Chain length 201, copies 6
């Protein structure tokens, strides 16, 4: 109902600044729409785009497995669903609070909702920071055009060629930047609540 | 209606702790979204990724059938729909209880809803535990890179090679962990209701 | 409207037991979700999985047509839409009954709704039983690994090989069991209404 | 709104029998669901299932074009959207009648709705009958297994083979039967309104 | 809301005849459903259905580009979205008129809605007429079975063959007829408002 | 709720002209529908439509990467989601303004909504203008039919041929025109608010 949805939206964002109320939800929606609309077109065919110059049985599959143990499409899907877990717990906690206080009326509980809001921002700051570090460790900042392989069952060292290294590099840097701004604005919303006044005190 | 949906949500979760009210529904939704979004991309092409070094008619199909009698994608779909059966029976039982007590007013029946809640948690604990044991028995904890085959109509013993063993191993361990936490938090919600006070008494 | 939907649900299930109110709708939904999610992955490629050892023009297509005149995917889709026809007629009959008695108020007609409920269960019992018998007659209980063919325009007798006979056998036995329980619980709901007191009297 | 939708459903079916109120809408929905769920799987690959024994340039395409100038999938889609045109005109005429009589109150116009109901049944009887005759003229009652071709630019007479003639024949006879019952029950609903008392008088 | 949607539908069609209120919206919906359901199946594979008898590098692509600079699927999508632009402007103009006159009450503005209705019909008449003329200029009334090509980098003159010319011709004539009736009934709705009394006066 | 949605639409467009209220939203919706319906059919297969006359390993992929570092489909998706970011921030700012002034009543804040409306139009003018300049710099106004390549690991200079250059050129000019009108009508809506009276004063 409108009267109910209108009271729920005012309670979920009563102790937030505009950074947490407007800017963060739009940035996270931007990231998801970009991944769903453009992701499969850039990285979906990476296996048939990895051509090695050989005919020995089993050497091609051994070299591709050593180059990419995990696809970026699978990495990014895990990041967006894990980062959504603290927000879904907080929104469910807020819904049951509004239900079990409507029948009563329709302080001690207002201070419980603030501690839950600080806890999910802190968890999102830790999860977002670990993901950026893993992305740099797994993929770097560029996709090369060739790759040298000396994995068994290959005889000697073989050269393999990759397709579309420019478009894949452009998409990798864009995702780093979009996630980097999500981390900065999560950190800033904790400062405007008083993270500074807690550290040195 | 809001007034009706608001009374239904307060009745379905009146004798639950936060583990059953918030944590379990989010974990089960996480598992389903991960399977639908990433499952086909990891395991969808497993048949054409199984290359055997032979030309005898019918030996390739006999070796693949001996390696995997059932695909993990089919196994995991069965697990999530079977585990949802006790919850759908409980939510339907609760809906008809609220309907046939609204026209009256709008004790003996409050104690019937508690026994139904304990029964579906116990059934989910048994179904979830059997699935984890079968997953380990069928697949183990890793996917190998080669496989030796001596099944008829093959002459001698042939070697077959598999593609992407690292990404398939990573996904198999992730699904074991997500299901393992679902089992732990189902067991804990039965303890907080008084499973301990029933066993030794 | 809630007040209207709430009166409709209480009328459609006023003379039903819990077997007809909870258990049957969940079993029928389980069957449909399993067919839509897993069916195409097991049986969708059966035509290119039927390899015959020959080069004569037209012999391959003649042997596949003699092996499977109808695919199980087409058989099962027909079964689930035919079994839904009696239930859709009953739910429409109930909706117009509630509409043409709201404007009046908002016995003779309560006894018309009971006879319509008994008639659609009896029709579903006949349709479900005929489908199980046809499934056994068309497919049996297992899918073989080879098949011998002496159909024109083949010269002599040729051997053809099939892929994935284990996974196809597992899925065929699962669908027989799910449909078998639907038949048992339709028969039991007619007994709890008084089928026994009508036969010998 | 419920109060509005409830008055609209009682006006659209105030001068109908149960044949027009329950049986016809379910039969037409059955036909559409069967076409969308099973149609592409039976007839979607008919072009690559038409193998001719030749290498002359352009003879294969000339023989397939002489065999099927129109696919059954395209024929059946046209039939279901054309038959829905009289019903959509009638339901729109009824909606504006209820709107322009609510503000007034909320005879001469009740007799206008009856003449519109008789006119759309008569149009559907003519369109449904013409479609059945064209289906028999274009396709017959069976799909053959071979086809002889003497069309230019073929040198001589060549034989072409078709795949899956049994499953295509089964689906063609099923669609004839489903449409045949739609025609019978449209004709019967005009008789129960008084078509008999108009012909001989 | 029903009370709001009910007042909006009576204002958008208060100065229309049944041609503009019922017949035109059904014809335009018919065209869109036919294009989405059957279009890709007839014209989606036109590039691989254009076989030329040559091996020179680049001659095949030069001949197909000279035959079809624009696909009918792209032409028809542009026609239906362009023709919908005047109707979307009119329906938005009507919505804001009803909103900014509800708070007041809930003549000079009734005459503004009539001039806007005449302007969008006139724009649709011009856009629909230009599309029919371009369709005849680009495609004609039939698709041939062969095509002769003397475009560079081809050496000499080569013959190319097309697949399914009968089904493509049938679909092209059907789309001309459906659009031709849309133009006639747009012209007739302007005459019934008084286009005749404006021309000679 | 209707009463709430009706007050929200009147506040979001209380200081707009018809250019911003009707014309701009329809033009932006037109662009998105054209990209989703026709984009993949024109540019989806550009990689297999780039045929080079060579057999050296790795020369084909090096030449395609030098021709197109970024696909137009990826460029246009980024443009439409970036241009939607200022509008989503403004509509969220307006929703919370209406909520936190309903409970009060149900000047200083009316002047805050005007400054936010001017700021998102100015941001959209800068983003739209930069996109048009980049589109001309990356792609020009036409797609050629051939391309000469002297990139390593190619030996000498090779010629590569492209398919369908006419249809790709037609679509590129259409997207430039649709975006050009979006820029003009964003600039005009700032002039009708008083951009002229601010520049020289
Ligand atoms: C109004 C005036 C405005 C002026 C604007 C100036 C701005 C310049 C833009 C630069 C940019 C923007 C990308 C779009 C990002 C959008 C973000 C949204 C993304 C959506 C999610 C594209 O710009 C390129 O466009 C080319 C078009 O062909 C132009 O080519 C010239 O002109 C043509 C004319 O037609 C001629 O035809 C053509 O012959 C000319 O060569 C160049 O100007 C330019 O390189 C990116 O530059 C790119 O350069 C390449 C070069 O190597 C980089 O490759 C790297 O090195 C390779 C070898 O080591 C590796 O192999 C590769 O792996 C690696 O990557 C890329 O990485 C990237 O840095
Ligand atoms: C800010 C500092 C932070 C530091 C972080 C340290 C953490 C280290 C992470 C480790 C991890 C995380 C996977 C992501 C899980 C995400 C969960 C979400 C999943 C979404 C659902 C990927 O890390 C790998 O990344 C490689 C990238 O190429 C790196 O390669 C090096 O550096 C490159 C540099 O570029 C160079 O290019 C490259 O030459 C270097 O070799 C290595 O560092 C590392 O192996 C998993 O390790 C993996 O190792 C492989 C090795 O064998 C395992 O293979 C197993 O053995 C094979 C042979 O028996 C079998 O054949 C295979 O079948 C079997 O499996 C895998 O099983 C797995 O254990
Ligand atoms: C915690 C302890 C718990 C212990 C649990 C014990 C329970 C045992 C389960 C048994 C079951 C469950 C299927 C899942 C059903 C789920 C229902 C949901 C379905 C979703 C809709 C799979 O179990 C199999 O798993 C194998 C895994 O490879 C194991 O192989 C071994 O260990 C591996 C180790 O890794 C080694 O690698 C491997 O070398 C070992 O060989 C075996 O243990 C076993 O055969 C079905 O058994 C199956 O057996 C095969 C054999 O022939 C049947 O084939 C039939 O005969 C062929 C020749 O005539 C025909 O050609 C074929 O056509 C026909 O069919 C199948 O029909 C089916 O009966
Ligand atoms: C509880 C007891 C209950 C007893 C029930 C008795 C009822 C019998 C049913 C009969 C029916 C039902 C189809 C399902 C319709 C469902 C409607 C819903 C459809 C969903 C939209 C399938 O039944 C077939 O099933 C076979 C299974 O293989 C059986 O084969 C035997 O047993 C196997 C055992 O395993 C053995 O393996 C196998 O070796 C045995 O040969 C046969 O019994 C039978 O032919 C249709 O019969 C079909 O026959 C074929 C023969 O030619 C017709 O082909 C026609 O002629 C060809 C040559 O001119 C042309 O080339 C072809 O073009 C043309 O068509 C078909 O047209 C059709 O008439
Ligand atoms: C109850 C009695 C009722 C009697 C009804 C009489 C009505 C006759 C209908 C006629 C119609 C309706 C199409 C359906 C339109 C539906 C609209 C909805 C569309 C959905 C969006 C199909 O009718 C055809 O059906 C054939 C079936 O095979 C019949 O073939 C015979 O009988 C078979 C028996 O089985 C035998 O097997 C078979 O050997 C016999 O040859 C013929 O009767 C007839 O040609 C269209 O006719 C078509 O003719 C072809 C001939 O050339 C035209 O080709 C043109 O010329 C080529 C060479 O220059 C070019 O190459 C081609 O490019 C060009 O096009 C087509 O253009 C079109 O005009
Ligand atoms: C009622 C009277 C009304 C009269 C109307 C007059 C208007 C004329 C329209 C002109 C237009 C409209 C495109 C539709 C735009 C719709 C916008 C919506 C788009 C949806 C998003 C299509 O018109 C073409 O149609 C041809 C049909 O085949 C006609 O061909 C003749 O007649 C046939 C008869 O059948 C005969 O068969 C056929 O043999 C005849 O040759 C010609 O008339 C004409 O070229 C575009 O013209 C196009 O010309 C080509 C030529 O080169 C241009 O190619 C360029 O050069 C190449 C070589 O350098 C490059 O290789 C290429 O890369 C480059 O591009 C294109 O770029 C484009 O400019």
């Amino acid at each position: 109902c409108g009267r109910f949805l209108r009271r729920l939206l005012a309670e979920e964002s009563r102790r937030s600044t505009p950074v947490g109320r407007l800017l963060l939800p739009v940035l996270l929606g931007f990231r998801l729409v970009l991944l769903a609309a453009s992701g499969p077109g850039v990285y979906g065919d990476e296996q048939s785009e990895f051509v090695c110059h050989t005919q020995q049985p089993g050497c091609k599959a051994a070299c591709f497995d050593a180059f990419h143990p995990l696809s970026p499409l699978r990495f990014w899907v895990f990041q967006v669903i894990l980062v959504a877990v603290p927000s879904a717990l907080y929104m469910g906690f807020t819904l049951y609070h509004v239900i079990w206080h409507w029948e009563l009326s329709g302080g001690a509980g207002s201070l419980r909702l603030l501690w839950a809001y600080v806890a999910q921002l802190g968890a999102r700051l830790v999860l977002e920071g670990a993901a950026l570090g893993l992305q740099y460790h797994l993929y770097g900042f560029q996709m090369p055009s060739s790759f040298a392989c000396r994995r068994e069952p290959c005889l000697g060292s073989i050269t393999c060629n990759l397709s579309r290294p420019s478009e894949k590099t452009i998409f990798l840097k864009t995702m780093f930047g979009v996630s980097g701004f999500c981390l900065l604005f999560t950190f800033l919303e904790l400062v405007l609540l008083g993270l500074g006044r807690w550290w040195r005190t």
